[PDB]
Scaffold this active site. Sequence first.
Site, PDB file in Angstrom:
ATOM      1  N   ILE A  19       0.537  -1.068  -0.010  1.00  0.00           N
ATOM      2  CA  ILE A  19       0.161   0.285  -0.111  1.00  0.00           C
ATOM      3  C   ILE A  19       0.611   1.019  -0.023  1.00  0.00           C
ATOM      4  O   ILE A  19       0.358   1.859  -0.860  1.00  0.00           O
ATOM      5  CB  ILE A  19      -1.181  -0.396   1.464  1.00  0.00           C
ATOM      6  CG1 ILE A  19      -2.320  -1.208   0.808  1.00  0.00           C
ATOM      7  CG2 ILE A  19      -1.893   1.350   1.421  1.00  0.00           C
ATOM      8  CD1 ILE A  19      -3.083  -1.100   1.713  1.00  0.00           C
TER       9      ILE A  19
ATOM     10  N   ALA B 149       8.978   5.814   7.195  1.00  0.00           N
ATOM     11  CA  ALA B 149      10.747   6.189   7.451  1.00  0.00           C
ATOM     12  C   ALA B 149      11.372   4.364   7.589  1.00  0.00           C
ATOM     13  O   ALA B 149      12.815   4.696   6.992  1.00  0.00           O
ATOM     14  CB  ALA B 149      10.924   7.569   8.452  1.00  0.00           C
ATOM     15  N   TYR B 150      10.417   4.241   8.409  1.00  0.00           N
ATOM     16  CA  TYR B 150      10.833   3.002   8.927  1.00  0.00           C
ATOM     17  C   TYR B 150       9.416   1.505   9.074  1.00  0.00           C
ATOM     18  O   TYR B 150       9.888   0.815  10.209  1.00  0.00           O
ATOM     19  CB  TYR B 150      11.675   3.082  10.741  1.00  0.00           C
ATOM     20  CG  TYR B 150      10.634   3.785  11.866  1.00  0.00           C
ATOM     21  CD1 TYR B 150       9.895   2.774  12.270  1.00  0.00           C
ATOM     22  CD2 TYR B 150      11.187   4.973  11.593  1.00  0.00           C
ATOM     23  CE1 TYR B 150       9.745   4.201  13.551  1.00  0.00           C
ATOM     24  CE2 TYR B 150      10.134   6.092  12.290  1.00  0.00           C
ATOM     25  CZ  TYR B 150       9.650   5.363  13.610  1.00  0.00           C
ATOM     26  OH  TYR B 150       9.003   6.523  14.347  1.00  0.00           O
TER      27      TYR B 150
ATOM     28  N   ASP C  35      -0.150  16.523  14.774  1.00  0.00           N
ATOM     29  CA  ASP C  35       0.221  16.275  14.009  1.00  0.00           C
ATOM     30  C   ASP C  35      -1.388  16.024  12.836  1.00  0.00           C
ATOM     31  O   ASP C  35      -1.075  14.840  12.347  1.00  0.00           O
ATOM     32  CB  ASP C  35       1.105  15.469  13.969  1.00  0.00           C
ATOM     33  CG  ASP C  35       2.208  15.370  12.847  1.00  0.00           C
ATOM     34  OD1 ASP C  35       1.980  16.718  12.539  1.00  0.00           O
ATOM     35  OD2 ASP C  35       2.663  14.556  12.302  1.00  0.00           O
TER      36      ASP C  35
ATOM     37  N   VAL D 281       2.962  -0.332   4.969  1.00  0.00           N
ATOM     38  CA  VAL D 281       2.191   0.339   5.141  1.00  0.00           C
ATOM     39  C   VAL D 281       1.531  -1.518   4.039  1.00  0.00           C
ATOM     40  O   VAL D 281       1.983  -1.431   2.612  1.00  0.00           O
ATOM     41  CB  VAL D 281       1.204   1.127   5.230  1.00  0.00           C
ATOM     42  CG1 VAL D 281      -0.265  -0.082   4.871  1.00  0.00           C
ATOM     43  CG2 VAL D 281       0.995   1.457   6.862  1.00  0.00           C
TER      44      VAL D 281
END
EC number: 2.7.11.24
Length: 338
Positions: free
Chosen positions: A21, A25-26, A139, A29
Amino acid sequence: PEMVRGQVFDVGPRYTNLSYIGEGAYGMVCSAYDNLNKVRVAIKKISPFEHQTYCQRTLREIKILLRFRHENIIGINDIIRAPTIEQMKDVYIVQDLMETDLYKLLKTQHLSNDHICYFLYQILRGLKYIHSANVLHRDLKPSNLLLNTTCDLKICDFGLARVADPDHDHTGFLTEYVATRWYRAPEIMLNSKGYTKSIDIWSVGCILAEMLSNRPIFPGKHYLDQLNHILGILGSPSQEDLNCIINLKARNYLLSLPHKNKVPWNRLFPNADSKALDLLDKMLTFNPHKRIEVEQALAHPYLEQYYDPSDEPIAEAPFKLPKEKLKELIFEETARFQ
Ligand SMILES: NOC[C@H]1O[C@@H](n2cnc3c(N)ncnc32)[C@H](O)[C@@H]1O
């Protein structure tokens, strides 16, 4: 183990038929078939254990999402990991499969006013619960708003969240780095650590503006540019709003600027519902103490077709290290799924 786009994705045998998907960064998905529930799910692979900051954000996400239960907040259905800390290198978070997110949607789709209203309602309904738990998301942005094929909206990614702490919010000028730049409230650059709920309302206001036009309203090109964009639309702060900023470096920076006029919201958004723009103005208020709060926003006339406080639940139980302790904490927090 199964492997996806060149990556160990060790989730079997409950979850099969994996499809890539997106990346992180680590973290990759994938979607997967859940052979127990007979439905396709989303699975996020997280590999945080080498870095204490990664372990911090992973622990926050897991702890908050496991404690929250709300229709407009993504749930954790399952967590997959090795049976022992020693063997635990990755953790996989299983969630409902969502069709898209608001970032991807705004890239190509114009929203009807009915969709804008419904999306905003759901954002604020979720936020009411988050804030009622004394938590700040910190965020909020379109990519952290997931949507399924029937436009149910779920807030995700609490890795940057904090417990609200309004008494310890004040700081100096140009120090603070909270939220993603375009969605960052003006006081973050002036005198605030982002420990009050008003930080999230600002982000929601930025999201509403972006829903109205499919472009970010305050597209600062870098950290210092962001306040230029905010003040270029809001205009110069009033004397009363400056007097609320006691810090001299911050106040004198604002006083050093030429006068700027407010750009009327209806000139920026000539097609928008006037009630939407009234609410937008109250969310994008410069002074965070005058800024509308989440329960007032839900009660705003723009949302009257949806507003129902008895169906806008609050949290039952508000929230009141080396990477090795954090790994142990993540291992403990995920035990219930073994
Ligand atoms: N999340 O970041 C990497 C990619 O994964 C996507 N995603 C994250 N959770 C998701 C979920 N529950 N359902 C469907 N997709 C998801 C996100 O939309 C982005 O495209």
